[PDB]
Amino acid sequence: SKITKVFAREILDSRGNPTIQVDVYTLAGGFGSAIVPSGASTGSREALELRDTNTKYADNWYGQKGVMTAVDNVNNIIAPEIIGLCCKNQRLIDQKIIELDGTPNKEKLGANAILGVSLAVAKAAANELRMPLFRYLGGTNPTLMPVPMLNVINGGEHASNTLDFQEFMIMPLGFRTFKEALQAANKVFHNLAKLLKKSGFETQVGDEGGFAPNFNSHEQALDFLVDAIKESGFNPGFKGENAVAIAIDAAASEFYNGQKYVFKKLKAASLKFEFNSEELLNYYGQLLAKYPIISIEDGFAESDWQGFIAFNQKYGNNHQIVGDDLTVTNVEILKKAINLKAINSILIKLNQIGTLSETLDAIHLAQKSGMTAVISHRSGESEDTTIADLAVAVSSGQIKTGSLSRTDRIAKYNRLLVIEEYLNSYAKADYIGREVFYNLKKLEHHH
Amino acid sequence: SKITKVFAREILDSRGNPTIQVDVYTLAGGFGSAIVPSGASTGSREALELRDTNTKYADNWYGQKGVMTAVDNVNNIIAPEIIGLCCKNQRLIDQKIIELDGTPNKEKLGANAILGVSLAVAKAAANELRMPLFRYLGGTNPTLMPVPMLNVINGGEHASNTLDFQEFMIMPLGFRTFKEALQAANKVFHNLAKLLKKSGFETQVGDEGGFAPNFNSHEQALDFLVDAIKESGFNPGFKGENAVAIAIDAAASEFYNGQKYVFKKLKAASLSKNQADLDEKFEFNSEELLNYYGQLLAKYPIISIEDGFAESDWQGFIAFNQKYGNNHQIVGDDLTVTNVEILKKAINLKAINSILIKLNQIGTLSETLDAIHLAQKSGMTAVISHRSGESEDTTIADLAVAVSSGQIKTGSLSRTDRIAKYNRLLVIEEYLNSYAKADYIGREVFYNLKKLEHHHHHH
Amino acid sequence: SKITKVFAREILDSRGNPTIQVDVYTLAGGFGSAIVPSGASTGSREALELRDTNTKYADNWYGQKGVMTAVDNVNNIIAPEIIGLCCKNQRLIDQKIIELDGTPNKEKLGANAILGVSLAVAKAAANELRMPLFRYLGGTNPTLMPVPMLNVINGGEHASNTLDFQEFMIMPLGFRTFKEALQAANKVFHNLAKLLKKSGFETQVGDEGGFAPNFNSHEQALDFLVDAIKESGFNPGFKGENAVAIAIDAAASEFYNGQKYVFKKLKAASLKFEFNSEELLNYYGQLLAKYPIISIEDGFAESDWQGFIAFNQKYGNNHQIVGDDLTVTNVEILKKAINLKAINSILIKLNQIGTLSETLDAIHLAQKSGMTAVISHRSGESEDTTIADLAVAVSSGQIKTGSLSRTDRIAKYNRLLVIEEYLNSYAKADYIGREVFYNLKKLEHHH
Amino acid sequence: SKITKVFAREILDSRGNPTIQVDVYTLAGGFGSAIVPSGASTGSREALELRDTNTKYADNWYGQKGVMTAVDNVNNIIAPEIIGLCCKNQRLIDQKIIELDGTPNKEKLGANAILGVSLAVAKAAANELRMPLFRYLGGTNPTLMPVPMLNVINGGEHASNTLDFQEFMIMPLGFRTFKEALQAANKVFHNLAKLLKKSGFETQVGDEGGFAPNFNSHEQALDFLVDAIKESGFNPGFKGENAVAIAIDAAASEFYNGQKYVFKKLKAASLSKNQADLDEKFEFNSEELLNYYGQLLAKYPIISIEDGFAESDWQGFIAFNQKYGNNHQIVGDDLTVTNVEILKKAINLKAINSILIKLNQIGTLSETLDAIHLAQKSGMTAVISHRSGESEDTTIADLAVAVSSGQIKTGSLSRTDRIAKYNRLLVIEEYLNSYAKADYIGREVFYNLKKLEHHHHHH
């Protein structure tokens, strides 16, 4: 049915910074509403969100982070182009809006203005057809509940501990249903908190609702994590029942100087810290041998493609190698990562590319080529749960959407529970654990 | 129109523990859906949520915290009783479900099963009437956007720091609109986070999205707060433009031992383990604690103090309200637990001039509205409050506007479990701006204060 | 839904004088109709109704009391401003209409033109939503049936008896339901009439359907009233079951010469009559000691604020002190009465302020400050029963709407019976008698 | 469309006594609601309302006047019989309810229960057809706005004055429109009230909103009336512009003793208690009373006299109609009590040329329409009448227009129980002005008068 009304407003995201919400109405009574997550404002590689810097709105909010200009672009520019088009024509609307902005990185109107409309339009159509969004996006056959990557331990520049790696995650593999996998994650998370309190660590949380306790090294954190998995009644590893694996996001661009990798906080604490690409690759195989790490993200720097290609060739048959800063959901960079065998997996961030149709094009390219497409959250989030319906719609098999606290993450797990409930009555719900890694030629026993 | 379907499910709250969501459908096409916040499981005074302890469900989630029994109670017991009733009859529905449970503290079916149905019914009726929830709850005339009590600094039992008081809050008073007041709180919050980092304090957050840095005393925390307000461009105080006040939740039941109040984290930091407090430096009887509050009130722009004395120390409250109740808000939380009979006692004894309102502590929407109305009729403010375990549900935003509470307490400025409520207030403000008027009146919401003074004035 | 039609006509009120009726229709089929009661045509303090004086309509009706000009203002000026607005936006419509008139006392278009539209709009919205008006006005929670103040005995300038006080009322307190309270009032009223006939007094009625028999003094009237309450089977007093209290409207502005109060008819009959403020205050305490008078209205003159303040301070803890001529439902005067502790209660007359939203603002201000808001009728009335729904919507706890004869009063009691019936099935109906006086610090036993 | 719900309740009438209101709903969304006026409880001739005497309800209201039994009879007996019938079948419904009661005077269920349903059914059918009630009752052609008989001066049993006749009325004849005639009555009424005050008379009102001042005789009252008409700017008379006539309800059954008519209030004012009326100064046989009427008719512009003779004095009526029936209206009220069989007798004996019509004296709408039609076919006028106990119900306004009665009797110009009917006539006049034509024909409504004369003419 025809779109009758498009309206945007400025609200706050989960970090206390402005973001944009878009409502869409249709003649037949459909209503769709979406909230854009936080993204990049500068960069030459990703779609660019538009903030209120150097406008009459700049002083509204701290750091000039308002998005009223994007709101004005939706309400004044995008809306009259879109009103009167059939809402079920997602690809036409997305293409309409891309051309209206006319720049490749969506810098003129704002990636946040464009994505907000793109997603609200799709939700309005799904609402009108009285279909869950994952059915509208995916057709009749989606059944695959994704394995979650749950943040638990955090490092990097902004964390006061001595972990130079960015984040550590658990992945609940050996379970028959999504509900049981989430229950296991709930047990590991709360037992993890209990152990951290028992050893005198802090249990406050960061932007993803995980912990950043004062660990002295990667090895200590990995040791602590293995123990918490065992305390909860599960088995650290890949195969078998109750298996729970670990995944790491190294964010290696952050500790690369163009020639060497430096564990800067570890080095400062001691007052091996330096690695060339081959030595860093060696450290990983040490960790991969000792601990049950199924997946490493941004193991090397965005400018160290040779490190990536050698990483993928040495461990990519048996471990997931994820690009994030390497690829920024850029289809052209993805084609090069495919052609050069640099990774076997990619993070998908809707607001890094700017529309739903482009995101689906990028997901399909990654999967056609034998990689997994891990649907990812952002730092600044909301109760919008699009990415839960997206992960089921495209059979991603994997989602990355935070630890087990804060509604900005929890809502996505709740949405997966509601989707699982819907598939249990009116279809079939599938949770296949370790089998989601179709990109790994062989998956071996960790022991 | 008639209720056709009531369905409940188990989901997770913002602390990662199970809670309950209820959906209600009406024959006219209305849909309403509510998520119950975390509450008390034991206690002799408030409505009791039901967890899965000693059931076939106990092993589902950590700590035996599932709520499948309450889900079954909605789906198997409450729903057949409620289907077929007109959804607009809120008081009838709530009365029927209260009688169906039959216990005064809602223990049999669970206060969480009962509140979930109570709220989803109301939202479905509003949805079918194409009215915002606050217009359904409140009639034609509500226009009052509430002043937020924004958590920023946390202390008390579980914080590693040396603050014995449980939380410190800012209240943006001297602003023309709710949007501008929220912009001011945004500026104080991020400037506070920058100042904290600048001094080497931690900037992770707790349950309500505020900070628990390693402060050494109440005074150190309060000094830091005052400077953050100034650094943001505002004036710490009560009256005038750009005024930003402070509120405190002492939660004094937690450091009362039966006879004296003991600043036990502060004392464990000075005294070694073999030492007694021979000088009574960290101990206070009621009057001595009242003297300490008076000192803080004179030096710092503290407009409101919650649970200044213990739940069993009614005398301490009565003396507190006697000495500073004309010029300062005195809130009962643990003292009153949203209990109508205890509020009548507090009104009769003149113990407080304000009360926190927690939907799930009383257990239905109609009883909550009875309790709010009794508080306001008696000249008290009713502060609509969040819980520690929360969701994207924003009922309390609409409730605060519907009853013209004038004040809401729903957390710091991070985490969607708090942010969604401020966002709902922004949407309500936008609705009132085009179809009515939105009023933000700042310090004028303290109608319970006989004489609000200038803070900078020498008292 | 959108207002499609607004139409006004001139009809007659209950005194045989013109008044205005307004109909409102909406696109969805809602219909609302309201009749304005009679109000002031001159005065510098209240909203001013517009009569046909010095127009081509002046000779239509006796005393030039037509309201065709107001009817023309609704049909020609107000209606085209309002048509096409959503009827559920009461505050917007009221604010629209205030600005359209543009004068503070609504003198240009007429308070009667403005109130007629304001009320008909609200009834149309309530009708459209298939909600009783008190639910539309008040939300989900209203349950409080008000205690009625029933006129029974009348004095003042226009009454040929020797009562200088304006009116005497009964208030049925000690009863469990509104129905029973009204039944008690019906018994006192008819027994009162029987006793008056037995003693040779006249039983014809005035504008409020009460009596004005040839009593010689206030004391004789109060004696007669106490006896009738006893004859009917009830107890004169405040507390206990079957308690029925008395309330007085002195209308003291009428017998004040700027320096003294003169009981003029009592003085003329004798051919104590003169009182300064302190002596008048003394007379009241005499009556308050002898008879069960719970409430005195306009005990002192509108220009004698010092008399009011001393009245409230000497008996206001235990008796209701009502302003009427003192405050004329004027929010700014009300603020001064609150600030100066002159009264603990105020009459609310919708057509003295001019719109429903302003009336609700005034009610809310009075209640927030610890006063009771007594919803009042006017002398010239109709079968419109708005004030019954208003008293329940705002939990006034008290209504003042006439004696127990004439449909211009009876309709309001019937509407309370229909509201009580609605609350009995679909909610709860509450009648709390003596507890409505939350403004009285202590309520003592009259004996 | 089909009736889906019939519900009755007890409310109060304009004298503060219980009466009954009935609501009727139809499947198509029609709603109709009627309020029954006060009637007779005992009597051998008219339909009988049922009060709560000797029931569990007797103590509810003063005088045992409740009507809950009739309410129960609607809700428990009549409603199940009527639900499912098409609402447009007025005659069917009325026939079914008459048979359901089974007694000729409607004593078993109550004439008030029966009439309430009868009228609410008709109003619901009109409401569902989006027709004003008078178009539903009357067809396409009604246009005749009735001349009002406006009570102004009251006497008889309960008035303290010395008038033995029960009421005096004005009728505004010489005017072009109903609005103008009502404006004239408004002017006479308020000028009459001013003149009364000017002479020290009382100005409170009785049941019908007219005056009962302390007049000494019929002549004094009639003189006052004539001067008020002149003071208002009109001409007391029958013909020509601005004519205002007078009508009288003698209610002569009240001062007939069986043999003679006795002006008993007039006599109690002249004669002391020990005195007989040796001269027969205040007594009248039939012929002597007819001579007295003739005297008043010659001096005063009296166009109509109601109940000039007693209910049992059929001969007095027959002689009255013989002597002055060509030139004056002769109304039966107590004589006929809206009884079809008694009207046939009055027609056959030529006792009257006009009859009052009281819905609740016969008990259904179809029987009322039968009675009106029989009266008009026989050359009589049918004057649609109010009762002493009334409400804002305005059925009789629509009824008077629907049947082209030409005359209505519904009280003075104060009290909503009377004013609402004039207001309904103003709304009907407005409807006819835009969608048809409104006719006010003044003196021409007396089609029952063989020769209406000029009053000022010497007869």
Author numbering:
A (entry chain B), C (entry chain B): 2 to 272, 282 to 457
B (entry chain A), D (entry chain A): 2 to 460
Please share excerpts from the published article on this structure.
Surface enolase is recognized as a plasminogen receptor in several pathogens and is thought to be involved in extracellular matrix degradation and host cell invasion. The assembly of monomer enolase varies among species and is present either as a dimer or octamer but seldom both. Among them, Mycoplasma hyopneumoniae (M. hyopneumoniae, Mhp) is the causative agent of enzootic pneumonia (EP), which is a chronic respiratory disease in pigs and causes significant economic loss in pig production globally.
Here, we reported the first three-dimensional (3D) structure of Mycoplasma enolase (Mhp Eno, short for Mycoplasma hyopneumoniae Enolase). The structure showed a unique Mycoplasma enolase with characteristic long loops in the S3/H1, H6/S6, H7/H8, and H13 regions. As a virulence factor candidate found in our previous studies, Mhp Eno showed a surface localization on M. hyopneumoniae cells as determined by flow cytometry and electron microscopy. Mhp Eno specifically adhered to STECs and recognized the host plasminogen. All of these results show the unique features of Mhp Eno.
